[PDB]
Design a protein around this ligand. Structure first.
Ligand SMILES: N[C@@H](Cc1ccc(O)cc1)C(=O)O
Ligand SMILES: CC[C@H](C)[C@H](N)C(=O)O
Ligand SMILES: [Ca+2]
Ligand SMILES: [Ca+2]
Ligand SMILES: [Ca+2]
Ligand SMILES: [Ca+2]
Ligand SMILES: [Zn+2]
Length: 316
């Protein structure tokens, strides 16, 4: 909408108060004019028609329980934008300040979220398996990272290319969670998953096997479900990324950790300069080794640790 940039206040899904950038024209809309061509948040109103209505509020205060998912989708889209701009000099998901659009209250009791090619979409969950999924900063950043991948590598969403696509979204979702520095970890979706159970999540990058996902190539899923295992085989790559950052000994192979910033630089370089739509795990190792070589030198610790981590997960 055309209007005046304003700043509202509300509470997110987990009851945290935060300020949000809004636009005033009769109503206050969830439209942040301060980031690129805008961040826009919509109400799907329990239906599956997208995007739905640009979120409008009478008084610029967003404290209703119904508001909470909208507050978080809008706020965390902004944090993710900040991460890509400040850390990688990338302006929105296309690198050209594309408007970022999110819809909440998608369907009834919908236990998922997704990038649909155009925008991010968040279910409210059924209150048992999930609370509203925009409450998870790693979730929001995972989904917006699919947009980044769409505009860069374009990894096809099936088999090994799809598992890489999935891992890239887990890696940057997690790096954004660390950037924001609120209860960061190497797990995915812990903030919104199972409000009745402490300490669980959808996936673990540090120990994928904790939730039944492979941590070595020898254990890859070869079946047809989940598009050839894209959320399962991502464990292999996530494990490699965790090792490059944090280090450790995995199946008797030792990796010296080089830290999250360098992990981020190496995978962002691989994503934007070397990976293709059909890149497999072997080609990802090559891309990451070449990216570390470009940044640090063929004989650097960084290159060595990338090699070590891929060796540890059985990827040559
Ligand atoms: N996002 C993942 C994990 C997931 C699976 C089922 C859900 O109901 C929610 C999340 C997927 O779509 O496979
Ligand atoms: C990152 C979590 C969300 C639920 C994603 N669509 C799966 O995985
Ligand atoms: Ca209000
Ligand atoms: Ca966390
Ligand atoms: Ca997390
Ligand atoms: Ca839980
Ligand atoms: Zn995903």
């Amino acid at each position: 909408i055309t209007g005046t940039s304003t700043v509202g206040v509300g509470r997110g899904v987990l009851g945290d108060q935060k300020n949000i950038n809004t636009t005033y024209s009769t109503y206050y809309y969830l439209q942040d004019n301060t980031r690129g061509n805008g961040i826009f948040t919509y109400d799907a109103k329990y239906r599956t028609t997208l995007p739905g209505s640009l979120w409008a509020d009478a008084d610029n205060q967003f404290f209703a329980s119904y508001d909470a998912p909208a507050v978080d989708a809008h706020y965390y889209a902004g944090v993710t934008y900040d991460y890509y701009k400040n850390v990688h000099n990338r302006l929105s998901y296309d690198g050209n300040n594309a408007a970022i659009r999110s819809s909440v209250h998608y369907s009834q009791g919908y236990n998922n979220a997704f990038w649909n090619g155009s925008q991010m979409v968040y279910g409210d969950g059924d209150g048992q398996t999930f609370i509203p999924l925009s409450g998870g900063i790693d979730v929001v950043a995972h989904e917006l990272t699919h947009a980044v991948t769409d505009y860069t590598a374009g990894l096809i969403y099936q088999n090994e290319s799809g598992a890489i696509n999935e891992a890239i979204s887990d890696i940057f979702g997690t790096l954004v969670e660390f950037y924001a520095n609120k209860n960061p970890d190497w797990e995915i979706g812990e903030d919104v998953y199972t409000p009745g159970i402490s300490g669980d999540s959808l996936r673990s990058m540090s120990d994928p096997a904790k939730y039944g996902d492979p941590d070595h190539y020898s254990k890859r899923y070869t079946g047809t479900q989940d598009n050839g295992g894209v959320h399962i085989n991502s464990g292999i790559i996530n494990k490699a990324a965790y090792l490059i950052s944090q280090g450790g000994t995995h199946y008797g192979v030792s990796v010296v950790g080089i830290g999250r910033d360098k992990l981020g630089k190496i995978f962002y370089r691989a994503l934007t300069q070397y990976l293709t739509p059909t890149s497999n795990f072997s080609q990802l190792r090559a891309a990451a080794v070449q990216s570390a070589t470009d940044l640090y030198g063929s004989t650097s610790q960084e290159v060595a640790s990338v090699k070590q981590a891929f060796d540890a997960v059985g990827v040559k």
